[PDB]
Amino acid sequence: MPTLDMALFDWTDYEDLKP
Amino acid sequence: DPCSDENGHPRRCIPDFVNAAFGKDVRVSSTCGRPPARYCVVSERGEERLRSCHLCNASDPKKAHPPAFLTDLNNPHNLTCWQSENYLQFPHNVTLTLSLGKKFEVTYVSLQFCSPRPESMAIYKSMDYGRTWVPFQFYSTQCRKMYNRPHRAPITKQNEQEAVCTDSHTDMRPLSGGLIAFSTLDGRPSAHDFDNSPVLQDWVTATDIRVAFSRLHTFGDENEDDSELARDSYFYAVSDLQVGGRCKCNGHAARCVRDRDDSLVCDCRHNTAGPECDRCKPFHYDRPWQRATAREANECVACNCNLHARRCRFNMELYKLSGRKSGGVCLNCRHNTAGRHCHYCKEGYYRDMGKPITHRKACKACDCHPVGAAGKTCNQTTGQCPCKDGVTGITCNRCAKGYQQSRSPIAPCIK
Ligand SMILES: *[C@@H]1O[C@H](CO)[C@@H](O[C@@H]2O[C@H](CO)[C@@H](O[C@@H]3O[C@H](CO)[C@@H](O)[C@H](O)[C@H]3NC(C)=O)[C@H](O)[C@H]2NC(C)=O)[C@H](O)[C@H]1NC(C)=O
Ligand SMILES: *[C@@H]1O[C@H](CO)[C@@H](O[C@@H]2O[C@H](CO)[C@@H](O)[C@H](O)[C@H]2NC(C)=O)[C@H](O)[C@H]1NC(C)=O
Ligand SMILES: *[C@@H]1O[C@H](CO)[C@@H](O[C@@H]2O[C@H](CO)[C@@H](O)[C@H](O)[C@H]2NC(C)=O)[C@H](O)[C@H]1NC(C)=O
Ligand SMILES: [Ca+2]
């Protein structure tokens, strides 16, 4: 039902994994 | 078809015994007519010897005497003889060599002469195509002097392959139509027991047959004015050369046949291959090759690659781990399948069921959620990616019951 929101993640650390 | 029974199932088959020489080109060291030259036929009636003379002319078929006449059809009232050049006495050796290019079991060798027979001659086999020559039999009036063998040496268990020499069948006398005829098992102690005699199994096996005429008879007079014509009376000539036997195919053929290369080869069956039928045909390597036996056909079987691999290879480990049933290993296994028989999906793919195992699109790609699942590799069946803590779904793209999303990509479901 509620899928994973990609926008919600804070990527400031782990800069490189962002899809 | 003797190679399978009344039902479908294979059985040991052996080809037929034949004149292996018939119609074959025999290679000869000598043939009159190039250039053309006179020969004389000598006959005797009691006190007198009569002599007719003739031209050997190679370039004229009505006066030629080529090798083809050794293996042609022998009509007893239209005889055709190959004829050697005149007076090749000693040490001159004149030879008829029959190369079968294929292993045969030889049972006899027969010659029929249109001249007086040789004083001394030898039959040889080769087991290795051209290369080496071994003796089957000698014929001479001087065995020790001519061939360094003793006269009528008795054949014995100790050496059952003994090339005997003998003064039998050496008489100048039948001035034509003389018949020499070697039989391979004649004399041999274990011939009665031949099919259980490895010594004799070898003995009869040969690829080639050489016949060497080493010295020729002359008359007790040989007149002085007869010098040219007496010289022109001495030659070797044969009307019919036979080699009885059968092809050696290893229980996997009932026929031998000339092929693509017009070279003699087994018409090879039971999914076997090669000229002797001694190995397996492409894509038939699930069990290792064998001579078909009395009890068992030993047809080598078709390896299974679930319609994914073009080639396959035998492996003993796999073969041994099954109860000696299957050992085929498919290769460069296409369409994102892998394995022995290409029966399961390549790591990081999973089987699109419904679409059957054999189909080109029977493995769909894995495609895990790039932050939800821990790993790229799904389950081969069900395609379930390996989900992180508090993630579920085949793609691992939703938190579980109990879990909310997080702000961190590392641990993205939390409680
Ligand atoms: C045994 O002796 C025969 C006579 O007793 C020899 O004669 C040969 O007969 C052949 C027929 O089978 C001839 O062929 C024909 O003749 C010429 C070819 O040059 C032409 O008129 C024809 O085209 C041909 N055949 C056909 C079907 O149209 C041979 O020419 C002739 N002579 C030879 C070969 O010297 C045989 O030689 C001999 N042995 C056999 C037949 O095996
Ligand atoms: C040997 O070869 C042939 C006969 O077998 C002869 O040559 C042919 O015959 C004529 C004359 O008889 C020649 O003119 C031709 O050159 C030949 N070919 C033909 C007709 O096609 C030849 O005479 C014989 N040789 C000897 C030396 O007797
Ligand atoms: C004729 O054939 C004989 C065989 O009977 C040849 O024999 C060779 O002869 C010498 C002695 O002269 C031996 O030392 C060799 O071992 C023999 N070898 C072979 C393969 O037979 C002989 O040379 C021949 N001669 C000619 C001119 O052909
Ligand atoms: Ca003949």
Residue numbers in the entry:
A (entry chain B): 225 to 243
B (entry chain A): 39 to 453
Sentences from the paper on this structure:
Netrin-1 is a prototypical guidance cue that binds to deleted in colorectal cancer (DCC), and it has been proposed that the guidance cue Draxin modulates this interaction. We show that Draxin is largely unstructured, but that it uses a small C-terminal domain (Draxin-C) to bind DCC N-terminal Ig domains and an upstream conserved peptide motif (Draxin-22) to bind Netrin-1.
Just upstream of the rDraxin-C domain, there is a conserved region of 22 amino acids that interacts with Netrin-1 (Gao et al., 2015). In the hDraxin/hNetrin-1 complex, the hDraxin-22 peptide is bound to the EGF-3 domain of Netrin-1 in an extended hook-like fashion, perpendicular to the long axis of the rigid rod-like shape of the Netrin-1 molecule. The key feature of the hDraxin/hNetrin-1 complex structure is that there are two cavities on the EGF-3 domain of hNetrin-1 that are filled by the hydrophobic side chains of residues Leu228Draxin and Phe233Draxin of the hDraxin-22 peptide. The hDraxin-22 peptide uses a hydrogen bonding network to align Phe233Draxin in the same position as Val848DCC from DCC, and Leu228Draxin in the same position as Met933DCC. In the structure of hNetrin-1/hDraxin-22, the same Q433netrin forms two hydrogen bonds to the main chain of Draxin to orient Phe233Draxin and Leu228Draxin for binding. The buried surface area is very similar between the Draxin/Netrin-1 interface (605 Å2) and the Netrin-1/DCC interface (609 Å2). Importantly, mutagenesis of Leu228Draxin has an even stronger effect because the Leu228AlaDraxin mutant is sufficient to disrupt interaction with Netrin-1. This confirms that the residue Leu228Draxin, which fills the pocket at the EGF3 domain of Netrin-1, is most crucial for binding, just like Met933DCC, which occupies the same pocket in the Netrin-1/DCC interaction.
